[PDB]
Amino acid sequence: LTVKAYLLDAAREIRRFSFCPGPCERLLSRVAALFPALRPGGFQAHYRAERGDLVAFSSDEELTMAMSYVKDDIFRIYIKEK
Amino acid sequence: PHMRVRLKAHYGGDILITSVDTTTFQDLCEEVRDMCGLHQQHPLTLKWVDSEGDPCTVSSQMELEEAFRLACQGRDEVLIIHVFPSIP
């Protein structure tokens, strides 16, 4: 349940936290509460595919999609600002 | 659970260091401000560098808690926290 959230080109701020009322909603609320410059609806979540490419998730579906794609034992997240 | 914190404050061209022995995000902030002779409200940025060498910003108890967890997993003996007071 180990999360490492990269605020983004390159990484500009990195925040780490644990995380197990939708999943995607709970996580995006965790991310919105942890990054001072972030407010709800103001950002886009991403994960990386095995090919390396960034891909937006925005629902519970695309979230488990993202999780399958994360095998480290560490779930990685990439946030862009709208 | 928690472990000693080595506070490294990068301020005024110096690297000020103290140790602090549970531990809360607020106590760390107060210790840094006292060490640097800062006003109670002086904004700080605190970061710990992880196993992949990434600086990770901690601005809360939850983040501090995660740094502690990950420090225990690594069987480290002290958690190093880097601190950067804001420059007016």
Curated annotation (Swiss-Prot), chain A:
The chain holds residues 4 to 102 of 440 of the full protein. This is Sequestosome-1. Residues 1-82 form the PB1 domain. The modification Phosphoserine is found at residue 18. The lineage of its organism: Eukaryota, Metazoa, Chordata, Craniata, Vertebrata. It is found in: Cytoplasmic vesicle, Autophagosome; Preautophagosomal structure; Cytoplasm, Cytosol; Nucleus, PML body. Induction: By proteasomal inhibitor PSI and prostaglandin J2 (PGJ2) (at protein level). By phorbol 12-myristate 13-acetate (PMA). Expression is directly activated by NFE2L2/NRF2; creating a positive feedback loop. Coiled coil: none annotated. The UBA domain binds specifically 'Lys-63'-linked polyubiquitin chains of polyubiquitinated substrates. Mediates the interaction with TRIM55. Both the UBA and PB1 domains are necessary and sufficient for the localization into the ubiquitin-containing inclusion bodies. Ubiquitination by UBE2D2 and UBE2D3 increases its ability to bind polyubiquitin chains by destabilizing the UBA dimer interface. Deubiquitination by USP15 releases target vesicles for fast transport into the cell periphery. There is a cross-link at residue 71 (Glycyl lysine isopeptide (Lys-Gly) (interchain with G-Cter in ubiquitin)). It comes from Homo sapiens (Human). It comes from the Eukaryota. Changing residue 60 to A: No effect on interaction with PRKCI. Ubiquitously expressed. Homooligomer or heterooligomer; may form homotypic arrays. Dimerization interferes with ubiquitin binding. Component of a ternary complex with PAWR and PRKCZ. Forms a complex with JUB/Ajuba, PRKCZ and TRAF6. Identified in a complex with TRAF6 and CYLD. Identified in a heterotrimeric complex with ubiquitin and ZFAND5, where ZFAND5 and SQSTM1 both interact with the same ubiquitin molecule. It is linked to Paget disease of bone 3: A disorder of bone remodeling characterized by increased bone turnover affecting one or more sites throughout the skeleton, primarily the axial skeleton. Osteoclastic overactivity followed by compensatory osteoblastic activity leads to a structurally disorganized mosaic of bone (woven bone), which is mechanically weaker, larger, less compact, more vascular, and more susceptible to fracture than normal adult lamellar bone. In a cell model for Huntington disease (HD), appears to form a shell surrounding aggregates of mutant HTT that may protect cells from apoptosis, possibly by recruiting autophagosomal components to the polyubiquitinated protein aggregates. Residues 1-30 are annotated as: Interaction with LCK. Residues 30-60 are annotated as: Interaction with PAWR. Disulfide bonds: none annotated.
Curated annotation (Swiss-Prot), chain B:
It is found in: Cytoplasm; Endosome; Cell junction; Membrane. It comes from the Eukaryota. Residues 4-86 form the PB1 domain. Isoform 1: In brain, expressed in hippocampus, neocortex and cerebellum (at protein level). Also expressed in lung, liver, kidney, testis and to a lesser extent in pancreas, intestine and skin (at protein level). Isoform 2: Specifically expressed in brain where it localizes to the hippocampus, neocortex and cerebellum (at protein level). Phosphorylated by protein kinase PDPK1; phosphorylation is inhibited by the apoptotic C-terminal cleavage product of PKN2. Belongs to the protein kinase superfamily. AGC Ser/Thr protein kinase family. PKC subfamily. The PB1 domain mediate mutually exclusive interactions with SQSTM1 and PARD6B. The C1 domain does not bind the diacylglycerol (DAG). Interacts with PARD6A, PARD6B and PARD6G. Part of a complex with PARD3, PARD6A or PARD6B or PARD6G and CDC42 or RAC1. Interacts with ADAP1/CENTA1. Forms a ternary complex with SQSTM1 and KCNAB2. Forms another ternary complex with SQSTM1 and GABRR3. Forms a complex with SQSTM1 and MAP2K5. Interacts (via the protein kinase domain) with WWC1. Forms a tripartite complex with WWC1 and DDR1, but predominantly in the absence of collagen. Component of the Par polarity complex, composed of at least phosphorylated PRKCZ, PARD3 and TIAM1. Interacts with PDPK1 (via N-terminal region). Calcium- and diacylglycerol-independent serine/threonine-protein kinase that functions in phosphatidylinositol 3-kinase (PI3K) pathway and mitogen-activated protein (MAP) kinase cascade, and is involved in NF-kappa-B activation, mitogenic signaling, cell proliferation, cell polarity, inflammatory response and maintenance of long-term potentiation (LTP). Upon lipopolysaccharide (LPS) treatment in macrophages, or following mitogenic stimuli, functions downstream of PI3K to activate MAP2K1/MEK1-MAPK1/ERK2 signaling cascade independently of RAF1 activation. This is Protein kinase C zeta type. The chain holds residues 15 to 100 of 592 of the full protein.
